[PDB]
Ligand binder design. Structure first.
Ligand SMILES: Nc1ncnc2c1ncn2[C@@H]1O[C@H](COP(=O)(O)OP(=O)(O)OP(=O)(O)O)[C@@H](O)[C@H]1O
Ligand SMILES: Nc1ncnc2c1ncn2[C@@H]1O[C@H](COP(=O)(O)OP(=O)(O)OP(=O)(O)O)[C@@H](O)[C@H]1O
Ligand SMILES: Nc1ncnc2c1ncn2[C@@H]1O[C@H](COP(=O)(O)OP(=O)(O)OP(=O)(O)O)[C@@H](O)[C@H]1O
Ligand SMILES: Nc1ncnc2c1ncn2[C@@H]1O[C@H](COP(=O)(O)OP(=O)(O)OP(=O)(O)O)[C@@H](O)[C@H]1O
Ligand SMILES: O=P(O)(O)OC[C@H]1O[C@H](OP(=O)(O)OP(=O)(O)O)[C@H](O)[C@@H]1O
Ligand SMILES: O=P(O)(O)OC[C@H]1O[C@H](O)[C@H](O)[C@@H]1O
Ligand SMILES: O=P(O)(O)OC[C@H]1O[C@H](O)[C@H](O)[C@@H]1O
Ligand SMILES: [Mg+2]
Ligand SMILES: [Mg+2]
Ligand SMILES: [Mg+2]
Ligand SMILES: [Mg+2]
Ligand SMILES: [Mg+2]
Ligand SMILES: [Mg+2]
Lengths: 316, 309, 309, 309, 316, 309
């Protein structure tokens, strides 16, 4: 089997970058809409006995993109592909990974079931919101990390990075930021939101020295940017010289762009798991780390039977 | 177990009509979108041990509505509903029921698989594009027919129906028109394209009634009506269960010679009816309500294939 | 993995022809019956790690042959074959592909489920009665077409084929005849019953060619031929991929006006050919052999949809 | 849900007896063959929400009867029966329950898989050849025993039963004969072949009773009876739950020294009884009827393992 | 169908308490071991058409108890029970709910799969280590919370409860403690915990004020008690007046009893999801909250089709 | 894909012997227990795209070892191994292969289901207690036989083997002893209990060889040996593939008249051999290594049923 790379309509630039890194052309596929807005898919070349990788991120018109991905997987599977891999850089419905005390769906599990029933044999994703989502599948899931790229960006783009502090915005971010700070051998600070009972103003609690220093918030995603904006205001109050935010998933929905433009961030850095050009047009402080080399290496290593976890710590 | 009816966002008015016919209130459910446009579903009441029916048609923003339906089914299933039934008046992706020479998905089969894995124990639908779609499922599927309501409309609205002709627009669905003509005891004239059309069956000085399962772009019925008017039919009617009316459909209907374009309300029609005066709607909420009630009570559903409740 | 071809008992000659075209011997298998008429299957050679193809058509004693096929698939699967493919030239129970108003099984879906649970990873078949049957499976299904061989036969056997007409016997399968007429660049005359038949398309002083997927009792083609001869066609031919010819079929063909009834050899025809002089057979073993070879080698199978190998 | 009993074509008289014992009429079903010998099934009454029992034994044309059973199960399942139970008095392919050194199917497992995928929720059977077959299913399987009826027959028909001997024909099934001898408080003499046979247990001047699960060709019981008569047994009886009697069985029984060959009516016996005077039948319809009634009512089925109803 | 409660060998006292609250006798079942130490199970009464509840906790000889539960489920399923429910107060292998950056199993997913294939139709458990484990199943899972009983105990046992801090010892507990701090209307604090090796705690960071106030560490389980002992040390160093520890699952393996006896806790409160009598014989400061009423009510409400989530906020 | 052999904790020496015969090192794996006694598994090397074999026998702390095996299979499966094979020399819960009259689990079927859901694509085992267990799986199962190694041991260790007798201890497994006697061309004397035992077959002044699949408490072989010594056998041997030897087994063997109790090393025997001088071990690591090598290379495994490698 040879590698065949197909792009969904969600992130064509990323698929092209990945295909270029692998020395391949993107596979021929028509992905459009019928008049009544049903997804139309037509695989334009034989995939019989091939190793097929479909690249589609959970962004934009999320339900349209997810349906398109499922339909493409099904089309490849009944076209007798030897193996079908969903390359989903930003996993959709990842934040609905549990019920809690609510009569709610576990939408991430439903997405996993849908991907499996469509025919996917392998999932490659980046920085799952909760790595327990790996257990929502029976097929193997390769959960890559943007951390090596993040460390590279910090070391090349921040002059005081040896004296910076890596800040977690919420309680759930402390593990990622501690891993980053351990790799950088720098201090870290932790932030979380206090109880919604001091009705005068919502209060952030910060532990760890940041005064007269460069502070770097790190998180998995910024959707409405409430989290990072609150954390950045807290950090500015505590005397940090400059504030950066680094995120793998730049969703930037709702008021995110206005909030960022009005915030004190020196830079908001995201990976390109989601297309960012349109958002960068409206926000001068968004910078993008390319992760297409990580994805290309993951695809190539899965195809060749090489170790993918080598990419957890080594920039290709 | 009691009946609980939940509405998706696609067709709220139909769900309300069904609930009124059953003497029930619609179940409390929040169906909206998160900021990033992911579907958010919250079941506002316990469904534990209940017989849940979720009403969602394959119309409008079809992918959003299908995702919403699947998410609602999943929420009800993991909330320990005794049984979950998807009431899908217009089945999405029904026209992608085969490959036939192309490297294409069988999207209808994928939709059936997704409904099954979401947890649906039962499907109720109306006038499937291909009844072979029933075989795409391993759970029972009740495929209702609009034909009794169509026959009622014909008898109460077309004064010359005893002399009329029932015309299939494409050769594929002529089975429907033969059944209707047999019920009415009339001739079934047939039409198919060769940019020219060929028609068998005397239509001169008569009323012709086109019958089909759906009108999407109305290319099919407008061409057939042009042919029929070429052959001297006094009036031409079109009757369809699913009024999708996407793309240029409203303009084509406005510029066509139809006396009336009758559709069922498996799909909401008010917006289309605003822009097109010749669209009339047959309410099929009684048929769906009766199907729900009969499946719940263990009564015969196939009795509805020939009886207006 | 190497190709291993095994024959069921239904169509030994076809399996041998396929094996010769592939340069292979048929795999050693004992397929017989115990005293109480239960199927006995014994794989006479290791299939461990091999690409196994089992050839069995849905003909003759259909239930025995289907059971034999399932038992052979199971034996090969638990003997650690790398892949098992059912080569089913005529798919059994294909005409029971829907319910449509009756409390009936969807037997084709049941057969698909049984083939899947027996362990088939892949299906190769020819001219499925309804291509929606491909959606009854979750494994890939390659539905081959007899059309290239049919076109070759028409060009080499009917001197007036450029002026002929391609006639569908029932409205359902007119898609096949339109494809054939487009390939030949001729008119497609159509026929359907109203005990009377209606025909569109000039057939006078011409050759008419009936094309259909199968002839079981030949009621369908004999009625169509009677109609065509009413309208002055000089000769009438019937061409079918599946020559089932059950019941009164041979007598009806003998008493009908067909110049020729051409069938493929998806079903053995020698016994029927003994009693009917106008039956001719098109060998499709090259198409099946090429499909097997291309699936094994990862080559395009759809290339066969338009090319005679 | 109410009990609905449907009969396959294999054993109509047994199904009628079961239905009479339950105070029910047999459900309306058309079970016939199309012209090309494909099974045709039509459920003549709604089974929606009902507890359906389909009675079909693995006898006669076994592959046809098995296909018919699977098709009936599928029809009832997609007709929204609340539960479908296959009542299979003689389980087909039960003797192919293992491979053991040969490249052979495990046909019993395939049959179990097919019954499961057809939609059976429950299996009722009698004296499975190997009770490990219960583990071939993931659904519950109630394996009934003919032993209470056999003990009743022995006590009411053999005057010297207190002095008799219960003999296993092959070493495999001696468990059955030990259970029977323990119930009767008698000795269990054993027999196995080395073309010569070896017997342990005093049989001289006594009655010997061969007990086995089935007699197919009667090679097993005729050899055992020859041995027993060599050792001076005054009379020899054979008792079996399944009287298959295929091949040369009737002639061998006629030429053997059996005082009686008693079988249950898990398989119809009238035709065999016409040609063999020493065959007698034990009715087990009460046991099957009680099992059906107890599974329906949630009552203990295992109570039947030791009690004649 | 009637309720039939069967007990496994793990927590017989809990099963008896549950049966008493339901006005039922425990079902007749033999659960022992063959000579070669395979599990032997024999159901001593017909379960045909019944609603069967099997109570087995993930404690003691965990693999033995898990196999016994699976075998009991299988026996009941093939004895034609109308419904089989696994009542698992402490879910075994819950802490192996993800891979992270390791070639490790997701053992919790495996256990969910084995429960499903054995024939379980429904799971009742309490305070799952990660509620994403609910998504590991396709059958419904009722995850009950000890929180109502915990609130009862706090209000009836700590005099200064209106002026206390609720402290999470790791991030996984944060939601829990915040909920509790909401109900009591008090302050919370979060401790970020880093482990390098299994069963050992490496570093801790306290975020949130605890000075001059009673501290209530709240967590889901105490296995080796390294987490709560390190957390109590951190709280005292930060100036907590006194430290209580409240957990639902009292595993108390390894050095746990020794560490607790040498620690500074006013009390270590656990529920009886795991049997505690032996541990209490050697450790004076362990108190037990009975949760058998919650479990019995959940069983009764699932049987009767009543609301189970009503128990998330209401002690019966 | 390359062969990777991983050892569970049950039988490390056997796994090492297998790995040496294949010219491989054991794969790096950490298999230990957390503080609360939950199994901890860590695969120390990439298995992506490799053919993984996990060696674990159903012995010792059986539930711990079975859990460890399932957890290892799961870890290898989600680490993208191309294929995972469980090499289980002694299959756990094999004796619970049926219910038979009791409200009991079929634990062997549960174990098969658990192995399948954990992700095993293939099972290799030796002398299953009941070969019907192969039908408990849907994946291929290669059931190897110790018989070639047993025959080799008999020929090289019993000087009078041409005159010896092969004795089955229970009627159930006499098939094994008939196969062995046929291979050796000797008589197969049989034994079964009625607290008394009955024996057929001249054993006087001869060597008797008891052959069975396993010895757990040795109640079965000690009773049989007592019977044989009653009938004048000069020496009595016991040969078993699985030497479980639980409970009072070692004391019974020490107090019995066995010349030798020979077992294979499907279960570690050193500890038992310390306390019992008459236990001897046949190494079957060559058979398991050859089976692994042949499954990997697509070579015939059944060739090992009759050939010592
Ligand atoms: N939502 C859609 N809108 C428009 N075309 C669609 C849609 N879904 C599928 N199609 C395409 O429409 C075609 C199916 O057309 P249609 O159902 O009218 O005819 P058919 O299936 O060929 O024959 P018939 O229904 O007459 O037996 C296919 O090419 C299919 O890909
Ligand atoms: N083997 C068989 N022989 C004869 N009739 C059969 C067989 N199997 C099914 N049938 C019946 O034949 C009918 C199907 O007929 P047919 O396929 O010719 O037409 P259709 O499916 O209604 O329409 P079309 O194929 O023209 O779209 C059904 O009533 C079905 O029950
Ligand atoms: N319908 C059948 N008629 C005859 N023989 C059959 C049938 N089905 C399977 N067999 C064969 O019969 C043999 C099984 O024989 P049988 O059940 O009498 O003995 P066994 O399984 O070896 O041992 P036992 O039942 O005494 O423990 C196998 O070789 C099997 O292939
Ligand atoms: N690990 C075990 N140790 C001891 N007894 C067990 C074990 N597992 C199951 N059993 C019991 O042992 C019995 C099975 O015994 P055994 O396999 O010796 O004879 P059988 O299956 O009745 O007949 P045979 O094997 O001779 O055909 C059953 O009652 C079963 O519950
Ligand atoms: O063995 P002990 O020292 O008593 O520790 C037991 C801890 O293990 C779990 O924490 P985990 O490390 O899984 O972190 P999490 O709760 O944040 O997932 C659990 O939350 C307990 O705090
Ligand atoms: O609230 P938003 O800023 O829109 O979303 C970003 C954060 O919210 C979620 O918890 C994510 O994991 C991030 O931590
Ligand atoms: O009873 P034990 O001696 O412990 O177990 C050994 C025998 O018991 C079982 O039937 C085995 O197959 C052996 O024949
Ligand atoms: Mg977060
Ligand atoms: Mg149409
Ligand atoms: Mg036709
Ligand atoms: Mg026998
Ligand atoms: Mg924790
Ligand atoms: Mg034995």
């Amino acid at each position: 089997p040879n590698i065949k790379i197909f792009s969904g309509s969600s992130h064509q630039d990323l698929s092209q970058k990945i295909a270029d890194r692998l020395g391949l052309e993107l596979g021929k596929v028509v992905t459009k809409k019928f008049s009544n807005q049903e997804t139309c898919v037509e695989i334009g070349e034989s995939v019989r006995g091939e190793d097929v990788y479909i690249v589609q991120s959970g962004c934009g018109e999320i339900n349209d993109n997810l349906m398109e991905l499922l339909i493409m997987i099904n089309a490849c599977k009944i076209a007798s592909a030897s193996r079908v891999t969903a390359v989903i850089p930003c996993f959709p419905y990842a934040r609905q990974d549990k019920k809690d005390k609510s009569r709610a769906p576990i939408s991430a599990k439903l997405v996993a079931n849908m991907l499996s029933v469509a025919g996917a044999d392998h999932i490659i994703t980046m920085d799952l919101h909760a790595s327990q989502i790996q257990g929502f599948f029976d097929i193997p899931v390769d959960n890559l990390y943007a951390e090596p790229a993040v460390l590279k960006w910090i070391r090349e783009n921040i002059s005081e990075w040896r004296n910076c502090t890596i800040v977690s915005p919420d309680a759930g971010g402390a593990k990622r930021v501690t891993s980053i700070a351990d790799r950088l051998n720098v201090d870290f600070a932790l932030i979380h939101k206090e109880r919604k009972k001091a009705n005068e103003v919502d209060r952030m609690v910060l532990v760890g020295d940041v005064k007269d220093r460069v502070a770097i918030l790190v998180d998995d995603m910024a959707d409405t940017c409430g989290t990072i904006c609150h954390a950045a205001d807290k950090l500015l109050s505590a005397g940090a010289t400059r504030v950066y935010a680094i995120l793998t998933h730049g969703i930037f929905s709702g008021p995110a762009i206005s909030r960022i433009n009005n915030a004190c961030f020196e830079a908001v850095v995201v990976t390109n798991t989601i297309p960012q050009e349109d958002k960068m047009k409206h926000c001068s402080k968004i910078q993008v780390i390319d992760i297409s080399m990580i994805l290309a290496e993951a695809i190539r290593r899965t195809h060749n039977g090489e170790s993918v976890s080598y990419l957890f710590s080594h920039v290709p």
